[PDB]
Subunit: 144 residues, 12 copies
């Protein structure tokens, strides 16, 4: 209906959610996470789409389309956060709000993980609050 | 909507001047208005929220020590203390129950001296740049934990 | 008998005309390609212009230019700041290679000042807008 | 109708007269306060001078000067090298603010060279001894 | 000489151009010639060797994910990805069976931008500067593990 | 009587001794530590006072009084060691000896804990020798 | 008149000994400029005072400048702060590819303060700067 | 005679184009000095040789100096080493708040070698330096 | 006979192999390692000598003799790798190939262990492959 | 005062010249005088103290290896080796019984090249700036451990 | 003729006030040179333009140079790039032990580009440079 | 009545004549020692020349020169870049000490630019080849 469209974009290695360090990332799969956010979104009157790719080209294409559509974006750039200026430069084209989400507490990990090249270029950032961080981002966008 | 699980929201230096403090960055809501809002939002989630603000690191450390003993989850905005105050970071390491760091402004988008938090490594997680709504997200997280 | 030249544009340059017009102009990538092909023809050059957001596709185009000894004018865009895979492709070029930045990268944020490509190519043009590509072609016309 | 000015002295400055006289003089903080009030009166200024080792108390004085639009002359002393809480209070001032260092901080150890306050105030006077405060008042008398 | 334990050799960007790629550094053998050589050398050690090359980080990550699930030992030459590509490093952390990083050239003897590998901390070990023979050393190691 | 007065000053978080990481800090409380040092001091013919504060203002006041009284100081600045130039500048006013004590081995901890801004400005430093480090400082001052 | 000023900094008077001479370069650019309908003058100095004076006058005259600061590029903030006064475009030219040389040569203090920079394209770099200014 | 020398470094001859001119500043400080019973002279140069000569003569004459090194502040050790020869006080003045500008402007190589520094208080900074020297 | 002579040189603390962190270094002694490499070498038609010293003077003398004899060298400089330019400058005199071996994965350890001052000056480097790394070095030299 | 628990005091380079070595910093006592003093002080605490000094890193490493095998507590003054000598640090990691690093001078108050010790992270703890009495404090600590 | 040029940079005209004067040093080196069968000239300037001109002429004449760049050592790449043009040997002399001074004085931008450097051996350092050139 | 001088050569200098002749010459260490003893004799100096790869042996020679107040000319070779134990021995010398490097260490890799010895000795000669030792002796002849 008049339901606000939101795009959740997950970058490299996040297709493997559930196989990795469960105390940090959970045993929830990417398919389980997508279903959860779509359902959570529906309860908030949001029309949520969830996409994951290991391809920077495909991710840049999704960001370019969100720019053109003025679709709010929740992005987890995963390891690209530490270095990928091509992804940061795509995000600068967005018009609607953009929230960066890290599942793990990147500040508590190795020094090479502390800095995000994305954070300066988005609305805000949520880190270390697990998969629930994505739900917080949707909650914020529901009342924006 | 049954207000029973206790949560402590702790605001550090200069946040008592919310509403007058650089409103183009932090907005026009006063600290009193924010405290009332978070208590009301908490009640809707069945949380019993207390909101406290101080410019005194001694008083803040005392509040953190008591939350450690009480096993009370904490939402803390250390404001400028985030950039350097290892005494505040070392108090937060004593907490047992979860702790969420909140920054109203997007610190990564400001001057380089504001980018690093000495607190972030020592808490559960951090919310930055989502305005006063970031406090409500932290409470939402704690409501279902 | 026209000398073949390859112009290669990297990530986000398919969106030319969308943002920051005072830097990048209001022209689309298709409009830029048509302009450089026409400018090349006037100089007696046979110019091909390609754009990709894919480092695999870009590396393939650089490898073919290395095999063909085709001079290259490359705008690596954000890849300039970090992408050693693209720099390692460019070192294999045999004919000259000119790096072009539309914007004055020295005048921007500190993370944009260093190019990992510049040490590995013939030379670099930065800050002279879309006309920078035409200068690169002018240089290659008399080389 | 005398213009109100606030002089605020930070940590360790209550001990003026105790150590390093060749830098800080042999005058006490009480003697400095009396001198600046008298100097201010001669310029038609109503000067108040306050000193604290408490960052809470200092932040409260800065907040009141922000609310009152009172020009401030501040010597943050050692807080200059690290105290972002004091710098974040000073950014809220509306009327001018002049940072004063009695000593030449550039001539001392490297840990003393950088002030976290200087970017956030109108301007800075360093190395001109107790007279630096009088220069700050002279500037504010004609502003 | 009984070819049964499966090993995966994965070559990253620009290695498809071996033979033409800076031959004074990397030698005159083609990638096809190298693959045939390692399969033959593996067979002599009773290893079943597969050799794959890609310029696509997506395709490489997919190969690493499958080796994680298959518990297949990996010999990887990440080439220029070694200097910066944390996405490739984070894929390799998923491997369970051993992983050996190989660099054909002595990266420590080249420009400063080539000295650091982001991969080395996350694998079993690293061989650098021993030419195409470094791949055979990695297989020799895996034959007796 | 003619017993030498010594001041032991403990900075932030040390009022919580006993609650923290016991393998490093012990299960001894600040009250237990104070009683121990006063008794140990008495055996050495020292009149020991032990004070603890989370307040930099209160600590600076105690250091200023030790400067005026020429009282030797044993100080554990705790986390203030890493950054607090106000505390370092107060200690430069001391006339009698000053020994900095760290309970934990700060060199073996995170890099942000390695540097003390206090060490250059005092007589000497004892680190990693636990609560017994305070007794070593008193032993040194007993024969000074 | 479409006047352009080409300004060469320290040691560039020694071009050919340091095989084209500075005189040969100047004659080439004046001729090349004329072909494009530009009135080009070429000046060289080892004096930062003289160079600053030339830049100040170009600021007042709104004359486009092509500058090769040579070694001043790596440190001379006085020259960078003179160039900030220019109103018309200013193109920095480096004959050599400074990115391919020692690390002390990589950074230019001038680049942030000018329109654009051309590096590594040899003496033809000056002709590209003139070609740019011919159509501006 | 209570003589004071005000020395202005590179690009400061362009004050007002770079709205008070250098001539207007000089006239103001000479007049302000006279009111304080000081005999003030104001000199400006883009030449480090000329500036060094002025500093050497001030050293020999024991004349207090107010210096604005402008961009030389960030790098010019030759000027810093001349200032070390001064016997009477020397006050460094910056018109702008250099701490509030780009990071390359934050450090002065002069500040360690002079009596004191005044920054960010505009052209009135020169008058504060004179006021200090009137009572020294 | 016509068997190729190879020198394996082990630097400081490697005389203690077997006593240290066994999950990394093994429980194999230096004597056991020497016997193993000599036997492995013989199977490859190499005449292997294995020497260990805590003395930089003695190590430099062995490298100088390998330079004069044109003997290929396998060296484990151990902690000297991180700083010892005297050892690096001796290795530059070698004519025949030289392979640097680290038993542990130095890249996975503390930051002070990441950089080797030796690696730029030798043929190549093997790290993190345990005592088997020495056998890989000999295998390489057997077909050189 | 019953001399039975064995303690080893190990002094590194240039400490054999105590008394002549920069006496304004290190004092006028000779190394022989210091050794006699520590043995006597140890005896009063019921410790059997041995004091050894060498300019030879090989000899020092040998002494550390034997203390590892003997489980003998060590008091070490590595002197200038503290700033760089990872071979000495890696020997000390083999010790099982406690180890106390002593610096006679306040290294934090000297040139920047003297501030960092590569040894401190690898020992029990460190005493600096308390002169020759710092050795006696280390023995006092070991007497009650 | 075995001609040697000794070139002194900024502030060295003030030797003795900054107790041997620059004139006393020049007379000493001319006399010392003559004893070694060298024809020595000694020149001093605070002008980088004048110094660059002297270096350019020494390059063309293949005259060995002994240079004391004084504060230019720490930053002046224009002077370093002039010295690269020299054909005959060039010895950099520092009167003081620059390694023992402030950290900003430790690095010379000249040292990489000359034959060798002598530091901390006082005015006798110039005589050692001449002694080296007498037997080269 | 001849003034005694000690020339001390550190690690790898026993191999003089073996490698990089364009820097180090084709002369052996024995040939260099004979040359400096003869050069010293001509200046009225009694010169002894010693070389070691052992930091213990070198520290012992420096300690004896400190006790004897013998001027020292030292080439610490690679120890210059890191060996604080050798620098701490040299600080104990009473008579002058001149550090000599045969090669121009400023012209080599960045790891060779810094000497930990130079701050602690009278002065330094670098890049003037074997003749650098003779210059050091010439300086000591008139001191």
């Amino acid at each position: 209906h008049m339901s606000k469209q939101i795009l959740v974009l997950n970058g490299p290695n996040l297709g493997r959610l559930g196989r990795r360090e469960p105390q940090i990332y959970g045993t929830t799969t990417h398919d389980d996470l997508a279903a959860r956010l779509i359902e959570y979104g529906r309860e908030l009157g949001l029309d949520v789409e969830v996409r994951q790719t290991d391809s920077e080209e495909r991710m840049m294409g999704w960001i370019h389309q969100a720019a053109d559509d003025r679709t709010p974006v929740v992005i987890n750039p995963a390891a690209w956060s530490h270095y990928n200026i091509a992804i940061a430069d795509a995000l600068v084209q967005l018009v609607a709000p953009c929230i960066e989400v890290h599942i793990s507490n990147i500040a508590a990990r190795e020094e090479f993980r502390h800095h995000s090249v994305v954070s300066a270029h988005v609305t805000g950032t949520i880190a270390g609050l697990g998969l629930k961080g994505y739900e917080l981002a949707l909650s914020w966008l529901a009342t924006d």
